[PDB]
Amino acid sequence: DISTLPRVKVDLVKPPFVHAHDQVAKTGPRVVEFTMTIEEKKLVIDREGTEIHAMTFNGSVPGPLMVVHENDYVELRLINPDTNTLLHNIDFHAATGALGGGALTQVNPGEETTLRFKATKPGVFVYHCAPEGMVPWHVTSGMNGAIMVLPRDGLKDEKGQPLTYDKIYYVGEQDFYVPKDEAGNYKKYETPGEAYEDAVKAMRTLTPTHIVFNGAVGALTGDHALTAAVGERVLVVHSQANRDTRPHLIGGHGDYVWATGKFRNPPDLDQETWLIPGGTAGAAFYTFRQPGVYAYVNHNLIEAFELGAAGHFKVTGEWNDDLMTSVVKPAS
Amino acid sequence: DISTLPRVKVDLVKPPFVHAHDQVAKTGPRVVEFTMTIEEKKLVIDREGTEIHAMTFNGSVPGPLMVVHENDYVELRLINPDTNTLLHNIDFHAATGALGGGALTQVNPGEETTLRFKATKPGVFVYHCAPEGMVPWHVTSGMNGAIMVLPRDGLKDEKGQPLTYDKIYYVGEQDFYVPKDEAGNYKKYETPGEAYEDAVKAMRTLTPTHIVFNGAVGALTGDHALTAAVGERVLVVHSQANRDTRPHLIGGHGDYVWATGKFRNPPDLDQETWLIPGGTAGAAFYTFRQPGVYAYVNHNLIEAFELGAAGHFKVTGEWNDDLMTSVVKPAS
Amino acid sequence: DISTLPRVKVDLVKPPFVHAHDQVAKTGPRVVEFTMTIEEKKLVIDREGTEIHAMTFNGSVPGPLMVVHENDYVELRLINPDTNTLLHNIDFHAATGALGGGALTQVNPGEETTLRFKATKPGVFVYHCAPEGMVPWHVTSGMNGAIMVLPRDGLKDEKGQPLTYDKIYYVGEQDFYVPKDEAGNYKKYETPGEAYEDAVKAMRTLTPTHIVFNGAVGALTGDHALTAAVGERVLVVHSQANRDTRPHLIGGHGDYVWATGKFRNPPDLDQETWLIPGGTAGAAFYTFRQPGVYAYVNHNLIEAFELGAAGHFKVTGEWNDDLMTSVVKPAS
Ligand SMILES: O=N[O-]
Ligand SMILES: O=N[O-]
Ligand SMILES: O=N[O-]
Ligand SMILES: [Cu+2]
Ligand SMILES: [Cu+2]
Ligand SMILES: [Cu+2]
Ligand SMILES: [Cu+2]
Ligand SMILES: [Cu+2]
Ligand SMILES: [Cu+2]
């Protein structure tokens, strides 16, 4: 009887940060209560000042990472305020039935709904909006995120030994398809209905105009760079709701990688680059061994360095000259 | 001596259905005899009525799924009737030597040939036409299918326990590259020779105009939706002869997935989405747990919902409110 | 103390050949000394005579395959002669720290540098040039290669038994993005600075104009076809620094495949086609069973047969009619 289970309310945080949770379950199964509010808003996505009408869960692209344990129940209250103009819903790849919840969560502006589902499979999973007849538009406008369902005894390596992370970050990679005129400049629109056929035409090229981490070119750089220290074990969760991506930590590795994100499978070891299929979330564990700046990129380098799919880690600590050294510094 | 083996003639069926076979081999190795007749025909591939000149094995896109056991011999009689205009052949990725049989099966219109090969590796494998100098044209005009070579003791899970399916479906995903004029309308042609350079130019964009299951937008929907019942174990074989695809069952999972299709490898567990590389067939096993409509899609959602790469399952049975429930239905 | 280790100087060879090495380490850890000289040069990449300004390590696209054992130290002397015009550096995906060495190896023309790093993870790894603000231009102009770090006890199969290769080849697959005018003809340029914005614009299409093995259409064909004999165990290392590829040996298989190239993981068995993500190197082991010509291709067949991503193996020996035979040769 689900009514006899403990309930716990989670307060979500903005990516790339992740709400507090326990890796190993410290309670029995619980109903884990989340609330998200849909926000349609203008977002500046690049250095040129290109501004799109984003569709978001909780004001961010991506939506927040939700974290539960296997065989918990996830209960989501989804709010569509009357300040929005569109119908939205939510589909969880973690859930079973009703198009992942999409069939049960259609909310017009001024409506709310509450969905409960049992998290029966451990892994990281995409969630996204999926309104009938409009699915790729919503998803490619930013309306996606991920949920992590941890095994009750936490993560394990290929030999079944515990893998415990010290820090976790969530990188949502978003492909935008900003409509272009024939000269190649981005077009702007006065209503969603007036933008829609042009959105569809831009999507049908299959060529994103921008591919960004955390919602904008340069979002995970500067004062918003990811951080770690030498010796820290970091889990990076990475999702892409629509298009394949190939994450790579420049100067590092994926020590243990679940490229398709499902923790019942043994991880791949020592990866340089891993492929996360469109519509999947993956997770990579790394222990930093050197200080300095790392670039975390989609290793289609055009996507990384021309279209925006790159962020930085700033790592503190001691340099290890055994692992790498300049023997002769650049000279004539 | 192959002449001392039993011979069994198979009568093929139209995808997404699969000819009758045994999962566990009930005989010793056999020569399994198949016949396919090449048919060049006009096919309407979308709701707008876009009509292409398809090149098919046995009148269908994809070609039929052939099913044998490891170390059977496959004997194929390939017929190119004099009503066709082109040279064709057949390459099996399951076979060893002679470009998969392609070098030995070149048939002009009015010719036939018979190829025999030993199915030495268990898995699902693409087959396709591959005439010298014209390969991608034939393949992207529909001339591809798959063959499943089952282990003699049937499929096994990651622990080596039997996995037995109740139903099997074959989804062939086809990328078409319909030539477009500068305004973006599809062009039409009076002969294959007159279409060819325009075909090549359209292929060189690397951007399909259509991506469809079972040969047309909406082919696996409505009265042609895939079916199952709650509790049924279903194997979905999915092939793509030219381009990567990322299947996803909306509302379900791949309980056991061989994303690159080869059964000597342990399956990946609990997949949301899996990547099948171009030129590969993969196979996903799922036990349905909820009734209703599921969408089976390529999870590039643009490819799914704008370009045609989506089908439906209709699943009968009892709803499980423990797994998913609406707690508060959408309301003001 | 690294000064007490043996030093061994390697003389590199042109791809697809690989310098001589031992599969099983016959010495303790060593400092393995390599020298590469950067060469900017004009290269004819297709049958039409399209000529690009290539940027190379050691005069070749790809750069040479370096081969060391796990926990060796790699010491590279990188030379940028004053005959070149650009700044270059080198990033090794095998290395840990300083952006894979990129931060420590920036060499102006007329400069050289020496980097040492410990090869701590066994696998095949990409290396490439990565100058700040210009990364995809250098990489997509040919400035990439791979390094193989073998386990000290050589390669092993999925059961931990030795896999020993008789021959090894390195296939570098390169995506070029040759700028096109509006009519679609390739443009030509009088300086790198004058080409750069057009390079960027061509890259931003995400649609390569050429995809080639060993630096040009047809490079691994004819007198430069790869060779083997029936019964020979061949390892093919394949890298792609920027874009996903899906290798396939037409008429063969990948008996044992490390699609993401890392030897601590068990190989995938019996692959028809495998996906190597952009920014990764993979390795496939095959024992030839039939003589004749094989085509080794990217199984996006458009990329293979229209854009250049295809090479040949010529295999000597005895035909096995048990594995494949023409029963009835093509006839009326
Ligand atoms: O085929 N693009 O996901
Ligand atoms: O690179 N397309 O398969
Ligand atoms: O998304 N191309 O690597
Ligand atoms: Cu929405
Ligand atoms: Cu989805
Ligand atoms: Cu054909
Ligand atoms: Cu093929
Ligand atoms: Cu360079
Ligand atoms: Cu790199």
Q: What is the overall shape of chain A? A: globular
Strand content of chain A: 35-45%
Distance between the termini of chain A: 76 Å
Taking all Cα atoms into account, the compactness measure Rg of chain A is 20 Å
Order of helices and strands of chain A: EEEEEEEEHEEEEHEEEEEEEEHEE
PDB class: oxidoreductase
Keywords: Copper Nitrite Reductase, Reaction Mechanism, Serial Crystallography, oxidoreductase
Assembly: trimeric
Entry title: Crystal Structure of Copper Nitrite Reductase at 100K after 27.60 MGy
Task: Tell me about this structure.
The structure is a homotrimer of 332-residue chains. By secondary structure, chain A is mainly beta. Helix content of chain A is 7%, strand content 40%. Chain A folds into two domains: 151 residues, Immunoglobulin-like (Sandwich); 167 residues, Immunoglobulin-like (Sandwich), CATH 2.60.40.420. The first copy, chain A, starts with 6 loop residues before the first strand and ends with a strand. In chain A, 58% of the residues are buried. At the A-B interface, strand 7, strand 8, helix 1 and helix 2 of A face strand 18, strand 20, helix 3 and strand 22 of B. Strand 22 of chain A pairs antiparallel with strand 7 of chain C, so a sheet runs across the interface. One nitrite ion (NO2) binds next to loops of chain A. Chains A, B, C: Its EC number is 1.7.2.1. Chains A, B, C: GO terms for molecular function: copper ion binding; nitrite reductase (NO-forming) activity. Chains A, B, C: This is Copper-containing nitrite reductase.
